[PDB]
């Protein structure tokens, strides 16, 4: 499955001036776009080479896009500001995210529109599309001001069609990269917790995309209770790292297996040292 | 394409 | 490049009146009717966005995208309606809004 | 709202004229438009934001600029006899509803 994200980012700086604005822009899991306002000099600049080979014209009207939206968030913040009629020292973060999901028959699957206030869910639109979804009781009143604006339909007719246009025609353009995937490169290694214990420790290397399973079983047994986990991290390449590791008591070791499962392997593969 | 339809506001 | 249904309509006791417009850059994803009085700045009735049908009043509208003719049109008429009728689209990228060849509507009480 | 300065003008040919536009919304879009009733209203220029103006459908014989935000004046270098026409200045956002005021009725006499 395919997707295209959107992530704005508004941080008001008080007795400073204007709100500091980061957007970022993710096809899968790759960067290709990029806006500060802050900057030297604030324009889009691209992160991905498939973008580099746009047209300047797309360029331009892209910074005119995220310059509005930088002044179009800097009035939310004061308006929310004044909805919890909250002091004008205090600093406040306000996050925007949309995207739409790509289905298998070369059609949208799904569409995504959220906003968050200092870390918290705020507002969304809901899965229909039509109707929105109001955590607190001041998210109501931007529920009232939207179902009125009818700016759910602008959602909609953004997220049904353009979007997948977007996303189509980035994919094409640089399907040799976007549509490729990279089998991880797997090993176990061990060392030494005590001189009756020992940790296994099952790594993968290199894949994309970041999704990927690492499991330990015990001669069929996957419980996650043992096992230590962390989060996938990127190399800073485009691809992406993660390691599994479980304590064990040495003798056993024959026992336990690894099991790895993602995209790019046709089949899951099980690992053992 | 970034979603610049109308003026989201709030 | 929009083109609108020029020939002027003229339908006299209180029924359906229909009216539609064509474009040939099939990217906007932006649509709009406007009416003009005689000597008046237009005025809007109906945006539409999304290809669904859309209800409003005595008015209602629909975009079928594929064949992209814009359809709105009255469920009953009047003398006071009578005006003329702008068809606007906006490209998704430039966002340059333009408006075809108005089409004159006249009642015959 | 929106206020177009000159509702009624009327000029010799070869004089250059200037139509005010001016508008309190503080909309990005603003556009220009002429309606003589031979096409309908056809676009002349339309600017983004400040200081940034595109071209139009009918642009030869007209200039613009952008200094302020809420601004857009539309100058006629050498007014002829076919631009004797009916001027709008419409504003809006992007995708929104367009506002335009009143008109400008524009006549260029021998």
């Known amino acids: 499955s395919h997707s295209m994200r959107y992530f704005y980012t508004a941080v008001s700086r008080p007795g400073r001036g204007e709100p500091r604005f980061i957007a970022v822009g993710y096809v899968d899991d790759t960067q290709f776009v990029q806006f500060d306002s802050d900057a030297a000099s604030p324009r889009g600049e691209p992160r991905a080479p498939w973008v580099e080979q746009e047209g300047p014209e797309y360029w331009d009207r892209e910074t005119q896009k995220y310059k509005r939206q930088a002044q179009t968030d800097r009035v939310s913040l004061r308006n929310l500001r004044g909805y919890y009629n909250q002091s004008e020292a205090g600093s406040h973060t306000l996050q925007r995210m949309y995207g739409c999901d790509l289905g298998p028959d070369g059609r949208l699957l799904r569409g995504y529109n959220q906003f968050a206030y200092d870390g918290k869910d705020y507002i969304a639109l809901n899965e229909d599309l039509r109707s929105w979804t109001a955590a607190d009781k001041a998210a109501q009143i931007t529920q009232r001001k939207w179902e009125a604006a009818r700016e759910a339909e602008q959602r909609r007719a953004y997220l049904e069609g353009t979007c997948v246009e977007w996303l189509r025609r980035y994919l094409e353009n640089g399907k040799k990269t976007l549509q490729r995937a990279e089998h991880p490169k797997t090993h176990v290694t061990h060392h030494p917790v005590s001189d009756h214990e020992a940790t296994l420790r099952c790594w993968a290397l290199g894949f994309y995309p970041a999704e990927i399973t690492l499991t330990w079983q015990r001669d069929g047994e996957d419980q996650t209770q043992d096992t230590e986990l962390v989060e996938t991290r990127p190399a800073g390449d485009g691809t992406f790292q993660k390691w599994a590791a479980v304590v064990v008591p040495s003798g056993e070791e024959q026992r336990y297996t690894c099991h790895v499962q993602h995209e790019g392997l046709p089949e899951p593969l099980t690992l053992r040292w | 394409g970034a979603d610049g339809v109308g003026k989201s506001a709030l | 490049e929009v083109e609108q249904n020029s020939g002027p309509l003229s339908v006299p006791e209180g029924a359906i009146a229909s009216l539609n417009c064509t474009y040939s850059d099939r990217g906007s994803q932006s649509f709009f009717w406007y009416r003009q009085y005689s000597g008046k700045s237009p005025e809007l009735i109906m945006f539409?966005?999304?290809?669904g049908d859309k209800e409003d009043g005595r008015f209602t509208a629909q975009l079928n995208k594929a064949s992209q003719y814009v359809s709105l049109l009255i469920r009953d008429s009047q003398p006071s309606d009578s005006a003329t009728y702008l068809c606007?689209?906006?490209?998704?990228?430039?966002?340059?809004?333009?408006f075809g060849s108005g089409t004159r509507l006249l009642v015959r009480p | 709202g929106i206020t177009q300065s000159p509702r009624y003008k009327i000029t010799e040919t070869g004089r250059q004229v200037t139509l005010m536009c001016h508008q309190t919304w503080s909309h990005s879009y603003m556009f220009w438009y002429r309606q003589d009733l031979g096409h309908g209203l056809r676009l002349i220029y339309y600017?983004?934001?400040?200081?940034?103006?595109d071209k139009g459908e009918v642009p030869d014989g007209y200039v613009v600029s952008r200094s302020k935000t809420e601004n857009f004046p539309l100058t006629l270098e050498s007014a002829t006899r076919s631009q004797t026409s009916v001027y709008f200045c419409?504003?809006?956002?992007?995708?929104?509803?367009?506002?335009f005021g009143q008109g400008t009725r524009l006549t260029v006499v021998e």
């Open positions: 600017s983004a934001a400040a200081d940034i103006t």
């Open positions: 539409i966005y999304s290809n």
């Open positions: 606007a689209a906006a490209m998704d990228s430039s966002y340059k809004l333009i």
């Open positions: 419409a504003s809006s956002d992007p995708g929104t509803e367009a506002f």
